């Protein structure tokens, strides 16, 4: 019954995300497998990521929505909460997950993370230290990485 419960919702979310997708976001299955998804987040307007197209890998479990989905970046980004591989340090993807949260709400939180990073809980210490000491140099590094890797 594990698989039928998870599959039934994921199906409900796939209908809603297509009808009413989050602003600057797009998400759907890579193929026949409903558990393995491909998404696209456009860099928030006004942010250092402005004009970039960033791809993500959403891997659901048969225990969804009781356990969170595995959301990882492919695309390189200059962000204190996103490391070299593409691991996202977001509270709701780890120890602060609730079964009331959808994939639409998880995409909007990533867009808020891109707009306003959290240097208090850094996954890349060097970038966090830069965002607080030298803001201008942090923004110059993030725009060069967005132009190079996200275009």
């Amino acid at each position: 019954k594990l698989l039928s419960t998870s599959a039934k919702r994921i199906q409900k979310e796939l209908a809603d995300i297509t009808l009413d997708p989050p602003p600057n976001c797009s998400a759907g299955p890579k193929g026949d497998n409903i558990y393995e998804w491909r998404s696209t987040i456009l860099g928030p307007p006004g942010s250092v990521y402005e004009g970039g197209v960033f791809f993500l890998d959403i891997t659901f479990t048969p225990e969804y929505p009781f356990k969170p989905p595995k959301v990882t970046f492919r695309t390189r980004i200059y962000h204190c909460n996103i490391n070299s591989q593409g691991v996202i340090c977001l509270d709701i993807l780890k120890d602060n997950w609730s079964p009331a949260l959808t994939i639409s709400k998880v995409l909007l939180s990533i867009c808020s993370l891109l707009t306003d990073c959290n240097p208090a809980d850094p996954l890349v210490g060097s970038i966090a230290t830069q965002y607080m000491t030298n803001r201008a140099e942090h923004d110059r590094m993030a725009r060069q990485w967005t132009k190079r890797y996200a275009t």
Partner: protein, 76 residues
């Protein structure tokens, strides 16, 4: 009547309530949905994250009756 289906939907399964029961904070869920969450150690409300026990569950009949009232109208 889309907004009314809104109020009889369970936050966990996103389908109309089935044995709607309430927890300490007042939020209501399907008996099966909130019971599945109750088997995970420190059980906390999926809506407001307030702490909850399964012993302290209350039937919300009014909502179960409302699900039947809206189902009769959807036939049309």
């Amino acid at each position: 009547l889309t907004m009314m289906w809104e109020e009889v939907t369970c936050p966990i399964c996103l389908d109309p309530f089935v044995e709607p029961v309430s927890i300490e904070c007042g939020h209501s869920f399907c008996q099966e949905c909130i019971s599945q969450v109750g088997k995970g150690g420190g059980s906390v409300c999926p809506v407001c994250r307030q702490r909850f026990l399964l012993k302290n569950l209350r039937p919300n009949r009014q909502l179960a009756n409302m699900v039947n009232n809206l189902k009769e109208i959807s036939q049309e």
